[model samples]
Target: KQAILYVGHGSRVKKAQQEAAAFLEGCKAHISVPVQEISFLELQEPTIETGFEACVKQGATHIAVVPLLLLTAAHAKHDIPEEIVRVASRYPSVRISYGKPIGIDEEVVKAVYHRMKDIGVPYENARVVLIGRGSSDPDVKRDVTGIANLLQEMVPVKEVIPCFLTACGPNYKEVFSELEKDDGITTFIVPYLLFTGMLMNEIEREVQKLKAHNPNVYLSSYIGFHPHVKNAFLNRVRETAANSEGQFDFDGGS
Candidate 1:
């Protein structure tokens, strides 16, 4: 049997994890791959191990492993792959097809556009700070920077400042000062994160703290809340479903 296992970056909040599972359920509506499971890489229940085990029990011969992430950060690059490699050890017969993160894409750009727009942000007058959960990995900066540049040209925000939360430069502390320097303009704090969790809460607090600095501050919902996001993730899932192009041996990993 063909199967799809969606791996999510789990949140500490129970509701946030539920929302992540709910989002995957919606994606299942668009896919008909027979057996499917949603699991988190960390923090929540139904881990990658349980997800893979469920697929095997369902008679899945070949399973598609998809990462539900905004960018190809450390989790997408190393953590998920490592976990899948470890889990594949228990089921040697089941063939695994590994997919990709939702990296830079036109659909993603447009998705973020709507996210900022959802807050009634004026594209021309606002400075959109595309917030990301930072990584020490260089690719994190590359992907976020590239996506920010794509968003920059699409909307005439004074500029789209791409910053991170930790292990990187131009974080909330760094960017807010520059934002305050701008005279009487609107500052929109757009978190490029996936769910409504600690990061979102922290960014909201950041907006509150800096409200006095900027003439106006608007905070938009996370990327996962938008519909266009579904299409982007679905496309990744479809691509992963059909992919046997790369070299991923269920044996080599073990």
Candidate 2:
């Protein structure tokens, strides 16, 4: 039998963790495997080992370790896979396959674009800054850049700037400085996030500072469990199941 284990980047916020669990439940209806479990990489209970054991107890001979992340960051590329390997080593007979993150899916493009649209800001004079949690991997930054390109096409903004909260250049302060130079532009901050957590709060805090300096600055709501996300995740689950021999490598070349 085959099982699906949905792994999320755990949040310290109780609400965020609850929301992640809820999102996995939504994905459960789309997946064929009844032996589905949700676990976290860190900062929460029911770790990867626990989830894997749960699946094994359910009589799953093969388990697909699906990462429910937005990018191929360090956690997706190394940490989660390392944990999975350690757990799989314990159960020599049970096979474990890894799935990639949500990398540049069209549905994600639409989700982010629609979130900006929902803000009801006229894009003609607006300058959009897509905010993301920074990553060490260059490929992850490239993935975000690709999404920014897609969003730029969808909106008629003067420019769609990709900035990060940490670890990368063009941080919020620098973006605001550039916008300060061009005072006429109405800055719209669109968070490239899956749920509301500490990061979202920090983004909101900075948006307030921007508002004080420039009255036209605006921040859109964080991206959380949009309907399209479920579909995108389902596609990942199916893709991993199809190649359940643990052969799927997260090719970051793209």
Candidate 3:
């Protein structure tokens, strides 16, 4: 049987890595073909190479790789493909099809809205802080801001505060410090992250410390386990699959 390799950007936090693996494991149950997990970074063993080899061993002639990323970045655009090219010599018979990262799909947008509603924040009007993992790309920040701005237009927010985990200005602490100065009934820190793990825990802990100053701050959970996310993942996977016109071609016989 052919296999689909879901690639994740490896994280140092063990739970964070497990979270990625767990989600892809869940995806395997629903996918039409066999599904496996691989990481593009150092935290995981076998890397993408080992993953492709596993697919080939399973009698897979074609391998579909769907990146479990949130947006376009250097990894999704360059690093991953470069790695694949390096390992291409080993899998002569296996064909490879690359899928786009799971960015701003419709269900992801819905998941954001759902997360807000679950926390009892008015979907129409609430002062919110949107947080991301932070990226070197300016548009990654722009994407977070754009989503917040668009959501605010529909959700009735007093304002949407854009923050990051790193590599950008106005981190969560800064967002809230400034927010408190302005005064709002409630400050919902909605993480723009997809999975749960250390960051979620750390964010929660920090919120507690912040609570010392302002009891009104509410830090929401990461954007994983939201029902809408499954649909979003499937949507991007299918979109990429349908767009592929070439077949898998390795050095060996097909």
Q: Which stretches of candidate 3 lie over 4 Å from their true place?
A: 12-14, 34-40, 121-123, 182-184, 195-202, 244-254
Q: Indicate the worst ten consecutive residues by lDDT in candidate 3.
A: 245-254
Model 3: residue 209 alpha-carbon error in angstroms: 4.4
Q: Candidate 2 on 1-254: residue-level lDDT in tens? A: 98999899898888888888888877888788879999999998689899999999999998888999888878887888878877777888877678889888888877776777787867675778888888777877898888888777776777788889888877867887766544676777889888776789988887787677788877888777887766777888899977845467433221
Winner on TM-score between 1 and 3 is: 1
Model 1: how large is the Cα RMSD against the reference?
A: 2.4
Global CA lDDT computed for model 1: 0.82
The CA root-mean-square deviation of candidate 2, after full C-alpha superposition on the true structure, stands at 3.0
Off by over 4 Å in 2: 181-184, 244-254
For candidate 3, give the lDDT: 0.71
Clashes of 1: 0
TM-score of each: 0.89, 0.89, 0.81
Please give the RMSD to the true structure for each candidate, in Å: 2.4, 3.0, 4.1
**Candidate 1 structure quality by residue, lDDT tens digits, 120-180:** 6466757788888888888888899999898887778777888999988778778887666
